[PDB]
Amino acid sequence: ELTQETGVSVALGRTVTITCRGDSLRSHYASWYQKKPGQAPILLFYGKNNRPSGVPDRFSGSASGNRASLTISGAQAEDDAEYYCSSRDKSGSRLSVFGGGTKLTVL
Amino acid sequence: VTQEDIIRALASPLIKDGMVDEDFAEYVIARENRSPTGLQAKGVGVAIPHTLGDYVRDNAISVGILDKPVNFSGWYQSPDPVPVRVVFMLAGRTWDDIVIVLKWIKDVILDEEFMKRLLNMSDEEIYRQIYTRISKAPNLSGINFSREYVRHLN
Amino acid sequence: VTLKESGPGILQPSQTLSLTCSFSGFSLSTFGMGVGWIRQPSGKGLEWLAHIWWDDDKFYNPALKSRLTISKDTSKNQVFLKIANVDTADTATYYCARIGEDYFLDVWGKGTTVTVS
Amino acid sequence: DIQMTQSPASLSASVGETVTITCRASGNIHNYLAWYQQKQGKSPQLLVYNAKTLADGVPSRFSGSGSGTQYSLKINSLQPEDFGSYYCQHFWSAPYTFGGGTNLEIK
Amino acid sequence: VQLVESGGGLVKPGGSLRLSCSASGFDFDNAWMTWVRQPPGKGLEWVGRITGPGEGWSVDYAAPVEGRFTISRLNSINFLYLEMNNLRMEDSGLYFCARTGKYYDFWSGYPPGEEYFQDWGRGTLVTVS
Ligand SMILES: *[C@@H]1O[C@H](CO)[C@@H](O[C@@H]2O[C@H](CO)[C@@H](O)[C@H](O)[C@H]2NC(C)=O)[C@H](O)[C@H]1NC(C)=O
C-alpha cells in the first residue's frame, strides 16, 4: 500500500527530503510522525500545510500525484529518528495505515 | 445585517423542526468566531457555517440568499474578508456526513452557470434545483431539505 | 389537458362550500407541476387564494388563512377547495388553473360562479 | 408580503397605435413576472412569461421589458381582437398576489 | 496533554488481556481515539479506532485483527480500554494510545476526509510466549 525507502543518511547541516509512495495518495494527503527510540514520538506534519505547536520551522511536507515527501533542511543531531508516513489504505476508506518507515541517520 | 442575525435566520427552521438542538445557534456562532468559514470563490463568495458537534439531532442543509453581502473571514486565513451573499448552514452528526456534503457543495460551487442563475432565483426554484442535485446522487440519503429551509434575508 | 370545475351554485352564509377541480390528460404527480385557485369578485380584478405543488405542501394567503383548506387527491385527478364561514363579500367567479413549470398559468378552466345569498 | 402597483389606472387607445402598460413591484422580484389578458365572460389567457419570453400562440407584437422592481408591456399595432383587461402576476414568493389591472377600451 | 498506558504483560498464545489508557489534559468525550502497535524491530501498523458520541461509538478495526480485538471506552470513569482474545505470535509489540482529529482541505480533499493524530503516549509492552 504505502512504500518507503528502507533508509537514508544526511550529512550534518545538509538538506534532504524523504519520499513516501503509494496508491491511496492520489485522493488523500499523508501525515508525518517522528519517533526517537526510547521516547514517545512527537508529531511532525498535519494535512496539506499545517505545522502544530511545539515543532520548529526547519522542515515541511508536500504531496502530489502518487507521491508525498517531507523536506528537512539543515538537519541537526537531534533529528536521528524513524519517520513514519500515514494515509488511507484505499481511497474513501475509514481505516488508516502506517508504512514501514524510514530510519534517518545524521552524521 | 450582521452575521449573528444571519445565523439565527437560518437556524430558526431547524430548531422549529427539531433537526438541531435549541442551543445550536450559540455553538455555531462560537465555532465561526474560533474558526471562520468564509470562502473566496473565483465567482461569488460563499460561507459554509457548520459545528461538527453532537448537538444536532439530524442532518440538514439550510440555504440563505442575501442581497447585501456580509464580510466573512476566510477559511484559508488571508487578511481580506470575503463578501458573502449565499449562506449554507450545515447540520449533521458524524464526520463522514459533513465531509460528503462538503464535497457535494464543492461540486455545486464550481458550476458557474448554476451560481450565476442562483443569484437571481426565487426560493422555490432554489428548492427544486438543490433538491434535484441532492437526489441525483446515490449518496447523501437521509438529509432533510424542505421549502422552509430556503429563504431570502433582509 | 382540459381542466374542469364544479361546485355549489347558491349557498347560505356562514356554511362551508366545497369546490372540486377535475383534471384530464395531465398528471399532478409530475415534478415541477402544481395547481392554484383564483377568485374574481364581480366588477373587480382577480386575487390569489392558494396553490399546491406536486409534493403536497401548502401555501395560503395570510389574510384569509383561517378560512382556506385544500385536499389534494392524485387518484381520480381531484383537488378539493373547502372555504369556511362564507361572508357576503365572497360572491365571485372562481377558477382552477395550473401553476405550470417555470411559473406561469398556461391552462385555465372556464370558471364557475359562486353566489352568497 | 410583496405588494404591487398597476399604472395608469386606465388607458384610452384607438386601433393601430402602439401603447404601453406598467407594473411596479414593491420589492426586488427579478424576472418572475407574467402578463395575462381577460375578456368579458372568459377566463384570462397568458400573454408573456418570465418577464420577456413570448408564449407559443401569442402574436409577436407583445413585448415585455423593464428591470428590478419596474416592468412594462408594449403592444404594437393594436387590433380589435386584443382589447380586454390586462394583469401582471409575481411569482417571487407566496402569496402570489395580483395587481389591480387596467381596462383597455376601443375608442 | 498527557497519556499514560498500562496493563501490558506476557500472555501465552490463546490467552486474553485488558489494556487501559489514561488521557488527561484534553477531553475524551468529543474526540476520536486510536490504537497503533509496533512489533520490536519492525515499523508501525494500525490496530483500530473508536469514534465519538455522534457515530454511535462505532469502532473501525485493522484488517489483520478485525473480529478478534475489542476497543471500548468508559467516559463515566474517563478510561480507554482494549480487550484482546486469542492472541498469536504476530501480535507482540509495544502498543500506543493516540488522540484523533479530522482534516479535510475543502477544494482538494476527498471524502470521508483524513484523520490526524494529535498526540501519542509512551506505550505499554505486550509480549507473547
Ligand atoms: C469588507 O471589509 C473591507 C475592508 O475594510 C471593505 O473594503 C473597504 O471598504 C472601505 C469603504 O467603506 C474602503 O474605504 C476601503 O479602502 C476598503 N478596503 C479594502 C481592502 O477593500 C469591504 O467593503 C467590506 N465589505 C463588507 C460587505 O463589509
Residue numbers in the entry:
A (entry chain L): 2 to 108
B (entry chain C): 4 to 157
C (entry chain A): 2 to 118
D (entry chain B): 1 to 107
E (entry chain H): 2 to 130
What wording appears in the published article?
All structures were determined by crystallography, except for the complex of 10E8 bnAb with 10E8-GT10.2, which was determined by cryo-EM and included a scaffold-specific off-target Fab (not shown) to facilitate image reconstruction. In all four complexes, the overall structures of the epitope scaffold and the MPER helix were similar to the original T117v2 scaffold complexed with 10E8, with backbone root mean square deviation (bb-r.m.s.d.) values of 0.73, 0.89, 0.75 and 0.62 Å for the 10E8-GT antigens, respectively. In all except complex 3, the antibody engaged the epitope scaffold at an angle closely resembling the interaction between mature 10E8 and the MPER peptide, and the D gene YxFW motif interacted with the engineered D gene binding pocket and adopted a conformation similar to that of mature 10E8 bound to MPER peptide, with all-atom r.m.s.d. values computed over YxFW of 0.5, 0.47 and 0.32 Å for complexes 1, 2 and 4, respectively. In complex 3, the FW portion of the YxFW motif also accurately mimicked the interaction between mature 10E8 and MPER peptide (all-atom r.m.s.d. = 1.04 Å over FW), but the Yx portion of the motif was divergent, owing to the antibody approaching the MPER from an angle differing from mature 10E8 by ~46°, potentially due to a different conformation of the immature HCDR3. In conclusion, despite variability in the angle of binding of diverse precursors, the 10E8 scaffolds stabilized the MPER in the 10E8-bound conformation and consistently engaged the hydrophobic tip of 10E8-class HCDR3s in a manner closely resembling the interaction of mature 10E8 with gp41.
